[PDB]
Write a protein that binds this ligand. Structure first.
Ligand SMILES: CC(=O)N[C@H]1[C@H](Oc2ccc([N+](=O)[O-])cc2)O[C@H](CO)[C@@H](O[C@@H]2O[C@@H](C)[C@@H](O)[C@@H](O)[C@@H]2O)[C@@H]1O[C@@H]1O[C@H](CO)[C@H](O)[C@H](O)[C@H]1O
Ligand SMILES: CC(=O)N[C@@H]1[C@@H](O[C@@H]2O[C@H](CO)[C@H](O)[C@H](O)[C@H]2O)[C@H](O[C@@H]2O[C@@H](C)[C@@H](O)[C@@H](O)[C@@H]2O)[C@@H](CO)O[C@H]1O
Ligand code: NA
Ligand code: NA
Lengths: 302, 311
């Protein structure tokens, strides 16, 4: 089967770290930025990595059991199936927002009542000893004075980390999945700046909450979720060091820039000096597969 | 080109339990028939022709689905709708902005926040409630009405429905997610609504994909939201735009462990699936959720399906 990418304009595609439209295409503010996102990680032959779900249905949700009067949520998969401890960093689709506090909204499932607001607010710190999703649990900040059961929900908004006090949100980072005595197993590996004139391309969407900059919380990811779903369904073999893509204006059919999609599931371009890069481009473009190329193929600056 | 006009029809090759509801972003949790065999549906989301033509308020992807955005003035009750990206909603063109919720016969309990963030402290989340059968619910005209006066700063707000409850009026009536809200008004009907989908008859019945949505109901059971197509099907069709080459696409719902066919279904060009229930009580709800629908062949609308399930 021949390799393709979705024929849908970028602005209509979705972030792979939480379900939202892509609102920008950027380079990392720090050129030396290494990333290790656990969601939005997929080899271009359809091999999912980290905690990455095949589809958005599973993405950015948390599910587990909690006892009345406890602080600990014992995680399951989003569909309610048991989470295998020591095996994965966290359940499939578990949020990977590091360096922030999580303000979550959850509810007991399934509904078994005829009245009442089922929604509960809980907060989670991601750098505390109780944050151990790799061991199957996370700890809420307060005692959970609500009925025992199976709860499901998501992060509604984020804020500056509680510790160290004063530090800002940094969504380029992931939380600490492991424990003080055990590292998280099967983490999707880090992605390093490619060098040689190339730079990693990130897709960004805004997420609710304050920060020290009084500005939007921007969530960078490596691939649109629809690309991941496509790769999982298509399972097209990788036949070069990179897939050459053209970013095309669908209205005129003009090529707006060349990109390389690497087998590891990330995109690069060559910025044409400072001030240049994919952030200069309109967001209504469609990426089109042109050809398999070697890693030594020299990209035209964008 | 020749390639585009000769592009072969396909469906996403992913187990059903891994696919998403097209009325709100969530995993599909079951397949059902409508409780009423005569049930007509007119969902505005999850509507797409199998050659990729979107209908109603249906978004191409999940990123835009089940979101509400608009401007509200401090001290007012009126949310003036925009598209999810903040661009003006061209009213009279559509029943509502793309991705706008289509949950009828219930009260909406929403959570919204001012966008973009311009704050360095505090909780930005605001709770509002919306009734869908009141005079102020006029999304087609460009606005919906909150139940209480909005005593928060004027501006641009984005959010979603967090949970639903029984409709306020008529008192005592239950949630009915088989229905859509009234998008129009008394002096103006909603233009360009996705059309109704009628039961096929002649042994066939419509297949619905369900996912539970938070909130109570009169039956003390989950609020199951039925939709016609997984969202991934919609995205696939929009991307592929494969020409429709027959009256219907014959699908087999195949067990990925044994490669055996668990049931025959017809996917009609209007963007919905049917099966033949194997007697009273039988249906696709009896099948495991880990099956994969595979395209077998184009067939005529008169093609008869092997009955599915057991009475
Ligand atoms: C636990 C909590 O709610 N902390 C609040 C804090 O609350 C109180 C409570 C009682 C007293 N008192 O006895 O006098 C004083 C303060 O109030 C501050 C100031 O409003 C909150 O911090 C601010 O808002 C949050 C959302 C952040 O944006 C923060 O930077 C602001 O200064 C504080 O909220 C906590 O802040 C910490 C970081 O300091 C984390 O972000 C927590 O998630 C957040 O709950
Ligand atoms: C305005 C308000 O807060 N009313 C309270 C009721 O909630 C409303 O119920 C109506 C249905 O009558 C409708 O669902 C609205 O959306 C609710 O705001 C509340 O009713 C109870 O809880 C509801 C969520 C619903 O499940 C209903 O069946 C149930 O009776 C009553 C009782 O707690 O208090 C009212 O003040
Ligand atoms: Na940890
Ligand atoms: Na109305």
């Amino acid at each position: 089967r021949a390799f393709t990418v979705p024929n849908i304009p970028l602005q209509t595609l979705s972030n792979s770290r939480f379900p939202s439209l892509i609102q920008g295409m950027i380079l990392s503010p720090d050129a030396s930025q290494v990333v290790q996102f656990q969601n939005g990680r997929c080899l271009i032959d359809g091999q999912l990595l980290g905690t990455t779900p095949a589809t958005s249905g599973q993405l950015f949700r948390v599910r587990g059991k909690i006892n009345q009067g406890a602080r600990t949520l014992n995680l399951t998969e989003v569909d309610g199936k048991p989470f295998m401890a020591f095996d994965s960093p966290a359940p499939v689709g578990f949020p990977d927002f590091g360096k922030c506090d999580w303000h979550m909204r959850i509810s007991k499932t399934p509904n078994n009542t005829s009245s009442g607001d089922p929604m509960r607010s809980v907060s989670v710190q991601t750098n505390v000893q109780g944050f151990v999703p790799h061991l199957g649990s996370i700890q809420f900040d307060e005692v959970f004075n609500h009925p025992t059961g199976d709860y499901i929900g998501t992060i509604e908004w984020i804020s500056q980390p509680s510790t160290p006090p004063g530090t800002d949100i940094n969504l380029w980072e992931i939380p600490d999945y492991g424990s003080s005595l055990s590292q998280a197993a099967n983490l999707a590996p880090p992605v390093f700046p490619p060098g040689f004139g190339e730079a990693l391309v990130y897709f960004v969407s805004a997420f609710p909450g304050p920060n020290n900059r009084s500005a939007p919380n921007d969530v960078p990811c490596l691939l649109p979720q629809e690309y991941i779903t496509h790769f999982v369904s298509e399972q097209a073999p990788t036949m070069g060091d990179a897939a050459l893509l053209h970013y095309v204006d669908p209205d005129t059919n003009r090529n707006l820039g060349e990109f390389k999609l690497y087998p590891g599931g990330y995109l690069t371009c060559v910025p044409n000096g400072v001030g240049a890069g994919p952030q200069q481009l309109p967001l209504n473009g469609v990426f089109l597969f042109v050809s398999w190329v070697s890693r030594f193929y020299q990209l035209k600056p964008v």
